[PDB]
Design a protein around this ligand. Structure first.
Ligand SMILES: Cc1cccc(Oc2nc(N3CCN(c4ccccn4)CC3)nc3[nH]cnc23)c1
Ligand SMILES: [Mg+2]
Ligand SMILES: [Zn+2]
Length: 314
């Protein structure tokens, strides 16, 4: 380093600070965008440039060429977190700023384009090793593997204590991306917020709140400008419809969300998703972290775009 500040063209320098930023089609700029976010989010001192670059390039190598659960998603989810952390400067610990951008870059490592359900029904070996949150325990496992490669220990300077704390933040953060766990997490956070028992000094409460940030970042396609939201949904459904095909090959009617013959039901399905998952997610997040409100506003804008799709106004 250390006088070696990463800088982005003006349009990117400004728009990267905004929640609805799209990282663009230039794959070779994504590492630099991430380093930029680490430096501003954490410090130019938090990681050794050489180690961080080697870590990033090994993480990229271990995402697959699947339509949605790919390297672009990793960097997209890390950017939403960057926007949360930067809008909530003083709420997060030094270990948290470090751990969470990494947890986001790593959160779908070695994803195969298939749900936990599909793995369980296929009887994949990963389903025997990890009975619940199957892919998420895998993703955390790949994260540790890459951290243990020569020249890849970005945490090398931390004490044995802090190293164990940061790997434990990463683990909880990655596990929280199991959407099956989100519904209960958000219900508890809602009750806590509304009986005024929420306490960010309670580690167990911080864990929940970080879990909600992870869901929020992970679903952030719904918080983009409509053309990004719409074109991202196409990639999401390309994966789901492939899984649906694979379900049919095991002799199992897929759920409609995964059935490409039920394309007509997408718009009504998106309404349910925004109502049951997305809006409640961003609403509770905004309650706990008021500056995240642009995610909720952007989400509601996208619900309204799907309602126009239904009314044939597009
Ligand atoms: C932004 C986004 C885009 C695509 C998929 C997505 O993830 C998901 N979408 C939904 N809903 C969406 C759409 N669904 C239907 C139904 C009939 C046909 C098509 N889609 C029905 C439930 N439910 C989910 N449960 C877990 N994950 C879900 C998110
Ligand atoms: Mg995932
Ligand atoms: Zn994800």
């Amino acid at each position: 380093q250390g006088l070696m500040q990463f800088t982005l063209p003006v349009r990117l320098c400004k728009e990267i600070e905004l929640f609805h930023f799209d990282i663009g089609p230039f794959e070779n700029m994504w590492p630099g965008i991430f380093v930029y976010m680490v430096h501003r989010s954490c410090g130019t001192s938090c990681f050794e440039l050489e180690k961080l670059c080697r870590f990033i390039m090994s993480v990229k190598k271990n995402y697959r060429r699947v339509p949605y659960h790919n390297w672009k998603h990793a960097v997209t989810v890390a950017h939403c977190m960057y926007a949360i952390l930067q809008n909530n400067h003083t709420l997060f610990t030094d270990l948290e700023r470090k751990g969470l951008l990494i947890a986001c870059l790593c959160h779908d490592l070695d994803h195969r384009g298939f749900s936990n359900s599909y793995l369980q029904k296929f009887d994949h070996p990963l389903a025997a090793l990890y009975s619940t949150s199957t892919m998420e325990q895998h993703h955390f496992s790949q994260t540790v593997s890459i951290l243990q490669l020569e020249g890849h220990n970005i945490f090398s300077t931390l004490s044995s204590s802090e190293y164990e704390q940061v790997l434990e933040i990463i683990r909880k953060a990655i596990i929280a991306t199991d959407l099956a766990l989100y519904f209960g997490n958000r219900k508890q956070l809602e009750e806590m917020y509304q009986t005024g028992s929420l306490n960010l000094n309670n580690q167990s409460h911080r864990d929940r709140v970080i879990g909600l940030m992870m869901t929020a970042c992970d679903l952030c396609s719904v918080t983009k400008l409509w053309p990004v939201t719409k074109l991202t949904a196409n990639d999401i459904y390309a994966e789901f419809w492939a899984e649906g095909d694979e379900m049919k090959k095991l002799g199992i009617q897929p759920i409609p969300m995964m059935d490409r013959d039920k394309k007509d039901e997408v718009p009504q399905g998106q309404l349910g998703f925004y109502n049951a998952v997305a809006i409640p997610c961003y609403t509770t997040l905004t309650q706990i972290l008021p500056p995240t409100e642009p995610l909720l506003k952007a989400c509601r804008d996208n619900l309204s775009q799907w309602e126009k799709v239904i009314r044939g106004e597009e």
